[PDB]
Tab-separated table of C-alpha atoms and ligand atoms in Angstrom:
chain	number	residue	atom	x	y	z
U	13	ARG	CA	100.013	-191.866	92.285
U	14	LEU	CA	99.321	-195.508	93.078
U	15	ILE	CA	95.933	-197.116	92.320
U	16	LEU	CA	95.242	-200.667	93.555
U	17	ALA	CA	93.714	-203.093	91.003
U	18	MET	CA	91.689	-205.297	93.359
U	19	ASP	CA	91.057	-208.419	91.310
U	20	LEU	CA	90.849	-210.943	94.140
U	21	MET	CA	87.539	-212.848	93.807
U	22	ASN	CA	86.244	-213.320	97.277
U	23	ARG	CA	85.091	-210.703	99.653
U	24	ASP	CA	87.076	-211.707	102.711
U	25	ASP	CA	90.453	-211.628	100.971
U	26	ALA	CA	89.672	-208.507	98.926
U	27	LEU	CA	88.647	-206.550	102.022
U	28	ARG	CA	91.573	-207.815	104.053
U	29	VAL	CA	94.214	-207.019	101.482
U	30	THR	CA	92.768	-203.620	100.678
U	31	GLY	CA	92.670	-202.824	104.389
U	32	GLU	CA	96.331	-203.788	104.699
U	33	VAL	CA	97.403	-201.315	101.985
U	34	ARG	CA	94.968	-198.524	102.674
U	35	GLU	CA	97.603	-196.169	103.975
U	36	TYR	CA	99.331	-196.270	100.618
U	37	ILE	CA	96.375	-195.739	98.259
U	38	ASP	CA	93.221	-193.688	98.086
U	39	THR	CA	91.706	-195.079	94.882
U	40	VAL	CA	90.811	-198.704	94.253
U	41	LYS	CA	90.057	-200.029	90.763
U	42	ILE	CA	87.371	-202.754	91.042
U	43	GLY	CA	86.615	-204.862	87.956
U	44	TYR	CA	84.467	-207.777	86.939
U	45	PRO	CA	86.540	-210.493	88.684
U	46	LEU	CA	85.423	-209.101	92.073
U	47	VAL	CA	82.045	-207.697	91.036
U	48	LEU	CA	80.901	-210.876	89.274
U	49	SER	CA	81.973	-212.950	92.265
U	50	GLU	CA	80.536	-210.798	95.087
U	51	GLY	CA	78.045	-208.384	93.574
U	52	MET	CA	77.925	-204.661	92.850
U	53	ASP	CA	77.167	-204.022	96.519
U	54	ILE	CA	80.907	-204.552	97.072
U	55	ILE	CA	81.486	-201.011	95.776
U	56	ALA	CA	79.438	-199.443	98.589
U	57	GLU	CA	81.177	-201.725	101.080
U	58	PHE	CA	84.600	-200.582	99.968
U	59	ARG	CA	83.565	-196.946	100.227
U	60	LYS	CA	82.224	-197.515	103.751
U	61	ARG	CA	85.288	-199.408	104.956
U	62	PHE	CA	88.023	-197.411	103.275
U	63	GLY	CA	86.632	-194.044	102.221
U	64	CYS	CA	88.384	-194.478	98.884
U	65	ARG	CA	87.351	-193.416	95.407
U	66	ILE	CA	86.355	-196.372	93.179
U	67	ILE	CA	87.108	-196.755	89.480
U	68	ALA	CA	84.878	-199.469	87.931
U	69	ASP	CA	87.077	-201.168	85.317
U	70	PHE	CA	84.284	-202.544	83.234
U	71	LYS	CA	85.893	-202.044	79.809
U	72	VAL	CA	82.496	-200.868	78.554
U	73	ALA	CA	82.183	-201.989	74.947
U	74	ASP	CA	78.559	-202.306	73.837
U	75	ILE	CA	76.128	-200.368	71.642
U	76	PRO	CA	75.075	-196.900	72.925
U	77	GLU	CA	71.780	-197.990	74.506
U	78	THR	CA	73.380	-200.808	76.480
U	79	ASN	CA	76.377	-198.673	77.453
U	80	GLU	CA	74.000	-196.107	78.987
U	81	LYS	CA	72.387	-198.825	81.111
U	82	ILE	CA	75.720	-200.200	82.303
U	83	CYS	CA	76.925	-196.709	83.247
U	84	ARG	CA	73.719	-195.856	85.097
U	85	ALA	CA	73.833	-199.063	87.089
U	86	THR	CA	77.522	-198.620	87.906
U	87	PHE	CA	77.140	-195.033	89.103
U	88	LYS	CA	74.009	-195.919	91.095
U	89	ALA	CA	76.125	-198.587	92.838
U	90	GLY	CA	78.417	-195.698	93.820
U	91	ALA	CA	81.436	-195.887	91.541
U	92	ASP	CA	83.237	-192.588	91.006
U	93	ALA	CA	84.399	-193.428	87.489
U	94	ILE	CA	84.145	-196.091	84.836
U	95	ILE	CA	86.644	-197.328	82.200
U	96	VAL	CA	85.248	-197.446	78.649
U	97	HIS	CA	86.692	-198.853	75.449
U	98	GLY	CA	86.967	-196.516	72.508
U	99	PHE	CA	87.150	-199.123	69.725
U	100	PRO	CA	83.342	-199.514	69.484
U	101	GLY	CA	83.253	-195.869	68.284
U	102	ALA	CA	82.174	-192.360	69.228
U	103	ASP	CA	78.454	-192.962	69.755
U	104	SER	CA	79.219	-195.675	72.319
U	105	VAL	CA	81.674	-193.398	74.198
U	106	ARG	CA	79.224	-190.473	74.051
U	107	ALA	CA	76.504	-192.622	75.657
U	108	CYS	CA	78.773	-193.160	78.675
U	109	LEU	CA	79.803	-189.478	78.817
U	110	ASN	CA	76.176	-188.396	78.832
U	111	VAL	CA	75.355	-190.505	81.908
U	112	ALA	CA	78.589	-189.488	83.652
U	113	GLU	CA	77.802	-185.794	83.081
U	114	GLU	CA	74.237	-186.235	84.360
U	115	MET	CA	75.490	-187.948	87.564
U	116	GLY	CA	78.703	-185.969	88.161
U	117	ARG	CA	80.986	-188.930	87.555
U	118	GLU	CA	83.934	-189.635	85.286
U	119	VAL	CA	84.602	-191.668	82.129
U	120	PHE	CA	88.156	-192.936	81.551
U	121	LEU	CA	88.802	-193.752	77.935
U	122	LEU	CA	91.000	-196.797	77.328
U	123	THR	CA	93.079	-195.920	74.274
U	124	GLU	CA	95.671	-198.706	74.096
U	125	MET	CA	96.001	-201.863	76.208
U	126	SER	CA	99.076	-203.258	77.909
U	127	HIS	CA	99.118	-206.928	76.945
U	128	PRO	CA	100.823	-208.426	73.840
U	129	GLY	CA	97.561	-208.901	71.927
U	130	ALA	CA	97.004	-205.123	72.005
U	131	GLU	CA	99.416	-204.876	69.114
U	132	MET	CA	97.040	-206.724	66.776
U	133	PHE	CA	94.209	-204.225	66.394
U	134	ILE	CA	94.167	-201.726	69.227
U	135	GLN	CA	97.562	-200.196	68.742
U	136	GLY	CA	96.859	-199.196	65.150
U	137	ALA	CA	93.665	-197.408	66.209
U	138	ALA	CA	95.068	-195.863	69.408
U	139	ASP	CA	96.051	-192.422	68.235
U	140	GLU	CA	92.698	-192.028	66.487
U	141	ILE	CA	90.850	-193.231	69.587
U	142	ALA	CA	92.712	-190.699	71.719
U	143	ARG	CA	91.956	-187.860	69.274
U	144	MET	CA	88.310	-188.963	69.342
U	145	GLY	CA	88.454	-188.683	73.120
U	146	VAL	CA	89.826	-185.150	72.901
U	147	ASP	CA	87.125	-184.182	70.437
U	148	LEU	CA	84.446	-185.637	72.724
U	149	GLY	CA	85.719	-183.728	75.740
U	150	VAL	CA	87.174	-186.741	77.547
U	151	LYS	CA	89.552	-185.671	80.323
U	152	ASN	CA	90.578	-189.043	81.787
U	153	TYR	CA	92.499	-191.746	79.923
U	154	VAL	CA	94.164	-195.141	80.328
U	155	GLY	CA	97.375	-196.093	78.498
U	156	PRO	CA	99.994	-198.881	78.759
U	157	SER	CA	102.917	-198.866	81.143
U	158	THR	CA	104.427	-201.655	78.987
U	159	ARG	CA	105.040	-199.262	76.059
U	160	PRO	CA	106.554	-196.026	77.407
U	161	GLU	CA	106.979	-194.632	73.897
U	162	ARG	CA	103.296	-195.152	73.129
U	163	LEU	CA	102.449	-193.657	76.496
U	164	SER	CA	104.411	-190.481	75.616
U	165	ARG	CA	102.655	-190.252	72.261
U	166	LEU	CA	99.280	-190.507	74.011
U	167	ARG	CA	100.302	-187.771	76.418
U	168	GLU	CA	101.127	-185.562	73.422
U	169	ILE	CA	97.633	-186.009	72.003
U	170	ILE	CA	95.652	-185.521	75.202
U	171	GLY	CA	97.660	-182.638	76.584
U	172	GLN	CA	99.137	-181.945	80.001
U	173	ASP	CA	95.854	-181.120	81.742
U	174	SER	CA	94.129	-184.466	81.121
U	175	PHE	CA	94.544	-187.233	83.699
U	176	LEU	CA	96.216	-190.440	82.536
U	177	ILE	CA	96.481	-193.683	84.518
U	178	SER	CA	98.457	-196.687	83.472
U	179	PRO	CA	98.288	-200.456	84.161
U	180	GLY	CA	100.812	-203.186	83.350
U	181	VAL	CA	103.273	-202.442	86.165
U	182	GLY	CA	104.801	-205.351	87.993
U	183	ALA	CA	103.350	-208.545	86.689
U	184	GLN	CA	103.249	-207.403	83.059
U	185	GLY	CA	106.677	-205.767	83.217
U	186	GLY	CA	106.014	-202.028	83.000
U	187	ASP	CA	108.328	-199.843	85.154
U	188	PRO	CA	106.834	-197.444	87.749
U	189	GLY	CA	109.508	-194.831	87.143
U	190	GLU	CA	109.472	-194.587	83.350
U	191	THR	CA	105.676	-194.857	83.341
U	192	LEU	CA	105.258	-191.891	85.684
U	193	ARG	CA	107.218	-189.681	83.294
U	194	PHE	CA	103.990	-189.515	81.314
U	195	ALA	CA	101.144	-190.931	83.392
U	196	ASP	CA	99.743	-189.232	86.485
U	197	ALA	CA	99.274	-192.520	88.323
U	198	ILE	CA	100.064	-196.179	87.963
U	199	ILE	CA	97.713	-199.107	88.504
U	200	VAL	CA	99.157	-202.146	90.273
U	201	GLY	CA	97.302	-205.401	90.974
U	202	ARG	CA	99.126	-208.733	91.323
U	203	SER	CA	102.476	-207.390	92.519
U	204	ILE	CA	100.600	-206.211	95.585
U	205	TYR	CA	97.627	-208.591	96.056
U	206	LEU	CA	99.433	-211.865	95.391
U	207	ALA	CA	102.196	-210.963	97.923
U	208	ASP	CA	102.342	-212.667	101.270
U	209	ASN	CA	102.882	-209.125	102.697
U	210	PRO	CA	100.864	-206.749	100.520
U	211	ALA	CA	101.563	-203.798	102.797
U	212	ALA	CA	105.301	-204.318	102.286
U	213	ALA	CA	104.786	-204.731	98.518
U	214	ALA	CA	102.842	-201.442	98.311
U	215	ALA	CA	105.364	-199.653	100.531
U	216	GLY	CA	108.115	-200.824	98.185
U	217	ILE	CA	106.350	-199.288	95.205
U	218	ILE	CA	105.664	-196.057	97.051
U	219	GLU	CA	109.404	-195.929	97.908
U	220	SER	CA	110.224	-196.118	94.198
U	221	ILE	CA	107.707	-193.358	93.471
U	222	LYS	CA	109.081	-191.032	96.158
U	223	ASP	CA	112.563	-191.632	94.778
H	8	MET	CA	74.236	-225.120	67.940
H	9	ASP	CA	70.533	-225.086	67.037
H	10	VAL	CA	68.167	-222.613	68.736
H	11	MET	CA	64.385	-223.100	68.825
H	12	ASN	CA	62.646	-220.914	66.214
H	13	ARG	CA	65.965	-219.206	65.351
H	14	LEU	CA	65.105	-216.520	67.941
H	15	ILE	CA	67.146	-215.563	70.982
H	16	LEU	CA	65.636	-213.181	73.550
H	17	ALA	CA	67.948	-210.359	74.683
H	18	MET	CA	66.785	-209.853	78.245
H	19	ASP	CA	68.053	-206.371	79.095
H	20	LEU	CA	65.367	-205.310	81.556
H	21	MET	CA	67.058	-204.203	84.797
H	22	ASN	CA	64.948	-205.648	87.563
H	23	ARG	CA	64.313	-209.209	88.486
H	24	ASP	CA	60.537	-209.151	88.660
H	25	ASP	CA	60.069	-207.713	85.193
H	26	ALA	CA	62.853	-209.824	83.704
H	27	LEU	CA	61.371	-213.058	85.041
H	28	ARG	CA	57.833	-212.047	84.078
H	29	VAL	CA	58.659	-211.147	80.459
H	30	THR	CA	60.863	-214.208	79.968
H	31	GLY	CA	58.043	-216.357	81.331
H	32	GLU	CA	55.627	-214.779	78.840
H	33	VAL	CA	57.814	-215.727	75.915
H	34	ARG	CA	59.492	-218.960	76.984
H	35	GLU	CA	57.199	-221.150	74.943
H	36	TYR	CA	58.685	-219.666	71.766
H	37	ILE	CA	62.408	-219.961	72.555
H	38	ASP	CA	65.002	-222.164	74.222
H	39	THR	CA	67.789	-219.520	74.484
H	40	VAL	CA	68.047	-216.258	76.461
H	41	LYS	CA	70.912	-213.757	76.252
H	42	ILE	CA	71.559	-212.039	79.613
H	43	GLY	CA	73.968	-209.092	79.747
H	44	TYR	CA	75.287	-206.497	82.122
H	45	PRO	CA	72.146	-204.336	82.364
H	46	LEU	CA	70.432	-207.198	84.238
H	47	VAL	CA	73.489	-208.715	85.899
H	48	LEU	CA	74.846	-205.475	87.331
H	49	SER	CA	71.393	-204.562	88.673
H	50	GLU	CA	70.489	-207.927	90.222
H	51	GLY	CA	73.757	-209.816	90.576
H	52	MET	CA	75.222	-212.853	88.833
H	53	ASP	CA	72.869	-214.971	90.895
H	54	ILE	CA	70.201	-213.966	88.370
H	55	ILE	CA	71.750	-216.450	85.899
H	56	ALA	CA	71.400	-219.319	88.349
H	57	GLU	CA	67.839	-218.200	89.016
H	58	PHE	CA	66.964	-218.254	85.321
H	59	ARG	CA	68.593	-221.745	85.051
H	60	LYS	CA	66.461	-223.006	87.914
H	61	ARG	CA	63.293	-221.365	86.667
H	62	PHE	CA	63.369	-222.095	82.923
H	63	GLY	CA	64.729	-224.878	80.729
H	64	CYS	CA	66.585	-222.379	78.534
H	65	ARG	CA	70.193	-222.060	77.458
H	66	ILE	CA	71.816	-218.866	78.804
H	67	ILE	CA	74.300	-216.850	76.774
H	68	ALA	CA	76.120	-214.261	78.890
H	69	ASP	CA	76.632	-211.176	76.752
H	70	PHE	CA	79.577	-209.765	78.645
H	71	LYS	CA	81.552	-208.432	75.630
H	72	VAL	CA	84.682	-209.737	77.349
H	73	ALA	CA	87.477	-207.295	76.444
H	74	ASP	CA	90.325	-207.398	78.918
H	75	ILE	CA	93.854	-208.793	79.152
H	76	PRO	CA	94.225	-212.600	79.148
H	77	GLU	CA	94.498	-213.027	82.893
H	78	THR	CA	91.413	-210.964	83.655
H	79	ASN	CA	89.446	-212.582	80.828
H	80	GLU	CA	90.139	-215.987	82.359
H	81	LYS	CA	88.697	-214.835	85.708
H	82	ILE	CA	85.626	-213.323	84.100
H	83	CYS	CA	84.915	-216.492	82.124
H	84	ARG	CA	85.429	-218.774	85.098
H	85	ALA	CA	83.076	-216.763	87.310
H	86	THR	CA	80.463	-216.589	84.536
H	87	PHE	CA	80.441	-220.305	83.793
H	88	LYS	CA	80.409	-221.150	87.496
H	89	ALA	CA	77.252	-219.011	87.748
H	90	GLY	CA	75.579	-221.222	85.168
H	91	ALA	CA	76.033	-219.567	81.780
H	92	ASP	CA	76.244	-222.017	78.865
H	93	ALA	CA	78.181	-219.542	76.686
H	94	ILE	CA	79.853	-216.178	76.843
H	95	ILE	CA	80.268	-213.445	74.198
H	96	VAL	CA	83.809	-212.145	73.802
H	97	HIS	CA	85.322	-209.302	71.815
H	98	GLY	CA	88.132	-210.057	69.383
H	99	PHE	CA	89.540	-206.468	69.096
H	100	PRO	CA	91.835	-206.961	72.136
H	101	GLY	CA	93.696	-209.734	70.245
H	102	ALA	CA	94.305	-213.427	70.001
H	103	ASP	CA	95.762	-213.981	73.410
H	104	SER	CA	92.688	-212.453	75.051
H	105	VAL	CA	90.336	-214.670	72.985
H	106	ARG	CA	92.484	-217.767	73.619
H	107	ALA	CA	92.240	-217.205	77.386
H	108	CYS	CA	88.450	-217.388	77.109
H	109	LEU	CA	88.543	-220.458	74.878
H	110	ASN	CA	90.847	-222.237	77.312
H	111	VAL	CA	88.459	-221.753	80.222
H	112	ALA	CA	85.441	-222.723	78.122
H	113	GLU	CA	87.263	-225.915	77.043
H	114	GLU	CA	88.158	-226.796	80.603
H	115	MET	CA	84.611	-226.215	81.849
H	116	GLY	CA	82.750	-227.665	78.879
H	117	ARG	CA	81.157	-224.377	77.849
H	118	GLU	CA	81.151	-222.197	74.718
H	119	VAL	CA	82.625	-218.931	73.482
H	120	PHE	CA	80.950	-216.691	70.902
H	121	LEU	CA	83.284	-214.278	69.125
H	122	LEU	CA	81.830	-210.855	68.367
H	123	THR	CA	83.264	-209.863	64.960
H	124	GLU	CA	81.425	-206.710	63.841
H	125	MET	CA	78.887	-204.754	65.888
H	126	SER	CA	75.486	-203.565	64.740
H	127	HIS	CA	75.469	-199.879	65.749
H	128	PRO	CA	76.632	-196.874	63.701
H	129	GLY	CA	79.831	-196.408	65.640
H	130	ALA	CA	80.983	-199.876	64.551
H	131	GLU	CA	81.969	-198.325	61.211
H	132	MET	CA	84.759	-196.293	62.840
H	133	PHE	CA	87.188	-199.042	63.905
H	134	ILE	CA	85.487	-202.396	64.241
H	135	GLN	CA	84.279	-202.833	60.698
H	136	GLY	CA	87.770	-202.438	59.256
H	137	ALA	CA	89.080	-205.142	61.631
H	138	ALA	CA	86.138	-207.517	61.378
H	139	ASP	CA	87.258	-209.823	58.616
H	140	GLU	CA	90.669	-210.215	60.284
H	141	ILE	CA	88.960	-210.864	63.627
H	142	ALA	CA	86.780	-213.558	61.973
H	143	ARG	CA	89.870	-215.181	60.390
H	144	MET	CA	91.562	-215.066	63.813
H	145	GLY	CA	88.523	-216.894	65.239
H	146	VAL	CA	88.802	-219.590	62.574
H	147	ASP	CA	92.497	-219.984	63.339
H	148	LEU	CA	91.767	-220.335	67.059
H	149	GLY	CA	89.044	-222.900	66.560
H	150	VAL	CA	86.112	-220.647	67.492
H	151	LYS	CA	82.822	-222.198	66.340
H	152	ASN	CA	80.277	-219.568	67.441
H	153	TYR	CA	80.081	-215.983	66.185
H	154	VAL	CA	78.071	-212.774	66.428
H	155	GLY	CA	77.607	-210.472	63.408
H	156	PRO	CA	75.290	-207.548	62.490
H	157	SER	CA	71.760	-207.819	61.147
H	158	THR	CA	72.017	-204.161	60.233
H	159	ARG	CA	74.584	-204.913	57.504
H	160	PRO	CA	73.626	-208.152	55.719
H	161	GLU	CA	76.367	-207.647	53.101
H	162	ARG	CA	78.912	-207.665	55.943
H	163	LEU	CA	77.180	-210.654	57.466
H	164	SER	CA	77.550	-212.636	54.181
H	165	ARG	CA	81.269	-211.878	54.114
H	166	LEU	CA	81.546	-213.077	57.696
H	167	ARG	CA	79.685	-216.297	56.876
H	168	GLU	CA	82.049	-216.836	53.934
H	169	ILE	CA	84.993	-216.685	56.335
H	170	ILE	CA	83.634	-218.870	59.109
H	171	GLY	CA	82.004	-221.496	56.966
H	172	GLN	CA	78.673	-223.215	57.397
H	173	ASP	CA	79.772	-225.466	60.239
H	174	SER	CA	80.058	-222.493	62.610
H	175	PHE	CA	77.012	-221.032	64.396
H	176	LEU	CA	76.255	-217.373	63.695
H	177	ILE	CA	73.781	-215.215	65.637
H	178	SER	CA	72.809	-211.639	64.854
H	179	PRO	CA	71.450	-208.713	66.883
H	180	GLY	CA	69.947	-205.496	65.552
H	181	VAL	CA	66.473	-206.691	64.531
H	182	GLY	CA	63.585	-204.536	65.683
H	183	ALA	CA	64.803	-201.461	67.460
H	184	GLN	CA	67.862	-201.047	65.225
H	185	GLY	CA	65.972	-201.911	62.047
H	186	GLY	CA	67.729	-205.046	60.850
H	187	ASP	CA	65.818	-207.252	58.405
H	188	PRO	CA	65.242	-210.844	59.547
H	189	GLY	CA	64.917	-212.075	55.992
H	190	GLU	CA	68.193	-210.864	54.602
H	191	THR	CA	69.810	-211.689	57.963
H	192	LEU	CA	68.660	-215.324	58.042
H	193	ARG	CA	70.071	-215.928	54.578
H	194	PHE	CA	73.430	-215.939	56.470
H	195	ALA	CA	72.917	-216.171	60.240
H	196	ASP	CA	71.414	-219.200	61.981
H	197	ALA	CA	69.436	-217.159	64.515
H	198	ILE	CA	68.476	-213.573	65.325
H	199	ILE	CA	68.669	-211.843	68.704
H	200	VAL	CA	65.777	-209.543	69.643
H	201	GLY	CA	65.522	-207.403	72.754
H	202	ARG	CA	63.439	-204.193	72.882
H	203	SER	CA	60.916	-205.162	70.202
H	204	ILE	CA	59.863	-207.937	72.591
H	205	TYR	CA	60.586	-206.711	76.112
H	206	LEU	CA	59.247	-203.179	75.686
H	207	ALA	CA	56.081	-204.390	73.901
H	208	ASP	CA	52.717	-203.993	75.620
H	209	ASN	CA	52.355	-207.727	74.981
H	210	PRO	CA	55.773	-209.448	74.769
H	211	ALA	CA	54.229	-212.857	73.990
H	212	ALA	CA	52.349	-211.334	71.064
H	213	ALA	CA	55.496	-209.542	69.861
H	214	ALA	CA	57.505	-212.773	70.019
H	215	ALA	CA	54.792	-214.745	68.290
H	216	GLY	CA	54.658	-212.193	65.443
H	217	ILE	CA	58.393	-212.338	64.917
H	218	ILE	CA	58.218	-216.124	64.809
H	219	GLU	CA	55.479	-215.950	62.181
H	220	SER	CA	57.736	-213.706	60.087
H	221	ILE	CA	60.582	-216.219	60.465
H	222	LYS	CA	58.305	-219.138	59.416
H	223	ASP	CA	57.214	-217.143	56.349
H	224	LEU	CA	60.852	-217.310	55.159
H	225	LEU	CA	60.608	-221.104	54.859
H	226	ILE	CA	63.978	-221.884	56.416
H	227	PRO	CA	64.504	-225.667	56.822
H	228	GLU	CA	64.731	-226.873	60.403
H	229	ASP	CA	66.865	-229.809	59.219
H	230	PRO	CA	70.564	-228.866	59.637
H	231	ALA	CA	71.776	-230.361	56.353
H	232	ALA	CA	68.934	-228.785	54.417
H	233	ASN	CA	69.586	-225.318	55.817
H	234	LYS	CA	73.310	-225.801	55.206
H	235	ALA	CA	72.557	-226.372	51.489
H	236	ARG	CA	70.113	-223.433	51.497
H	237	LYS	CA	72.674	-221.153	53.101
H	238	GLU	CA	75.362	-222.256	50.648
H	239	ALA	CA	73.132	-221.220	47.772
H	240	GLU	CA	72.335	-217.899	49.446
H	241	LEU	CA	76.005	-217.119	49.856
H	242	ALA	CA	76.859	-218.251	46.297
H	243	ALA	CA	74.128	-215.925	45.012
H	244	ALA	CA	75.395	-213.100	47.158
H	245	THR	CA	78.965	-213.499	45.817
H	246	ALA	CA	77.952	-214.148	42.191
Y	301	LIG	O1	95.486	-202.243	79.160
Y	301	LIG	C1	95.043	-202.665	80.225
Y	301	LIG	C2	93.778	-202.326	80.775
Y	301	LIG	N1	93.386	-202.805	81.938
Y	301	LIG	N2	94.196	-203.668	82.675
Y	301	LIG	C3	93.732	-204.111	83.968
Y	301	LIG	O2	94.507	-203.493	84.991
Y	301	LIG	C4	94.833	-204.436	86.025
Y	301	LIG	C5	96.331	-204.686	86.035
Y	301	LIG	O3	96.573	-205.700	87.015
Y	301	LIG	P1	98.037	-206.384	87.240
Y	301	LIG	O4	98.954	-205.354	88.002
Y	301	LIG	O5	97.747	-207.502	88.127
Y	301	LIG	O6	98.605	-206.827	85.918
Y	301	LIG	C6	93.901	-205.603	85.819
Y	301	LIG	O7	92.707	-205.398	86.518
Y	301	LIG	C7	93.651	-205.583	84.300
Y	301	LIG	O8	92.376	-206.116	83.918
Y	301	LIG	C8	95.469	-204.068	82.200
Y	301	LIG	O9	96.173	-204.789	82.848
Y	301	LIG	N3	95.824	-203.545	81.001
Y	302	LIG	O1	76.658	-205.744	67.780
Y	302	LIG	C1	75.970	-205.932	68.755
Y	302	LIG	C2	76.301	-206.779	69.859
Y	302	LIG	N1	75.456	-206.933	70.860
Y	302	LIG	N2	74.230	-206.268	70.864
Y	302	LIG	C3	73.349	-206.528	71.973
Y	302	LIG	O2	72.241	-207.288	71.518
Y	302	LIG	C4	71.033	-206.778	72.099
Y	302	LIG	C5	70.142	-206.207	71.019
Y	302	LIG	O3	68.999	-205.689	71.682
Y	302	LIG	P1	67.854	-204.845	70.894
Y	302	LIG	O4	66.970	-205.899	70.091
Y	302	LIG	O5	67.045	-204.286	72.026
Y	302	LIG	O6	68.476	-203.788	70.015
Y	302	LIG	C6	71.472	-205.889	73.261
Y	302	LIG	O7	71.625	-206.667	74.438
Y	302	LIG	C7	72.802	-205.353	72.785
Y	302	LIG	O8	73.670	-204.997	73.867
Y	302	LIG	C8	73.835	-205.425	69.842
Y	302	LIG	O9	72.780	-204.875	69.843
Y	302	LIG	N3	74.742	-205.294	68.819
């Protein structure tokens, strides 16, 4: 139920920290901070070193044709799943779903974001974006740990069978406990990777989850 | 900003050899190339530094930045360090996310382009209804470079009205998506073209033909003269 957001930007530190918390997590979310600094080959390296599943948090948000290319390149690099924005509309999400279905991979639809700015435009479109996901056959979603009430509303729309993961825990102030009342797993980055003892930080979170 | 021939190449080929060959075939016609994730994820960010060493062209990184503030800052820093002159950012995630990009660009002496409304059909679902507010947010934040759709010139004129003539506006959707350069360049300062050039049997010939079509529009090269021309185009559009 704990996914590591590995946003360190150099290979040595990213590999070291992930290795230190490997016993506590089996899925690592890798985004552009690490990929743009070290290359897409870092995904294969993580899989070789840790045997973990990799979610590419690329916030895909282009036209359909470009989205297809991004998804193909990301799955060829070995990612198990990719995070896609829904605000650009249904055709753009469908382009990602088509490639994921062809390659046996997964699309996670980001319905509402966790930061303050999310309230400006995303929040008002969130329920509609989630219903669009349901209509498109999306089974994996991302929602905000910082707004438990919004997270419960999202869970209502997507149903109990869909998988929901949630960022914003720790640094952004979301609570592991309340978040896991609705989400299947929480994403944690800085609270673990900025710590002098990341293993102890991750163990602490796991403790809270067990409890 | 002023781009040679008002034409920006969208280089979305996915392998280095072809990307460098096609850009080399058309470089005499442009001074600005837009590089996005199809090429960067396939060949690495080092491809930007390679283009900067190989050609005397400005590089706009079309990364559609759309994350939380802290992650946006990291993305922008890595992108500018790699050599990009500018980066394209989404406004839908909010003002704090755009401000994070502007702060890094200011610190590093680079530029941010704010994407206000997209060119594809799906843009009508959520983005179009937020676009004017996103453009006003850009004005409030001091953004001076914008991206708007060639596929909806009426929407592009409204965007120009909001951002004013002292902001730079570029527009994709010409060629493959059917946008009209003429109506588009009544409002935008430059058009972005990808597939119509890079999938052509002769990219140089395709680029040269588009440039002839742009010259047929008789758009002044002189900044003040095109500012007056654009003011009249907008006044006519709103009259
Ligand atoms: O709504 C969202 C979507 N994605 N992320 C991402 O999830 C991670 C959360 O990291 P943190 O624990 O360090 O805040 C980062 O990679 C960030 O880009 C959010 O924080 N909020
Ligand atoms: O609203 C937008 C924003 N960006 N792009 C991008 O501009 C280019 C247009 O390419 P094309 O001429 O091949 O359609 C591609 O890189 C695409 O991702 C659009 O097409 N529409």
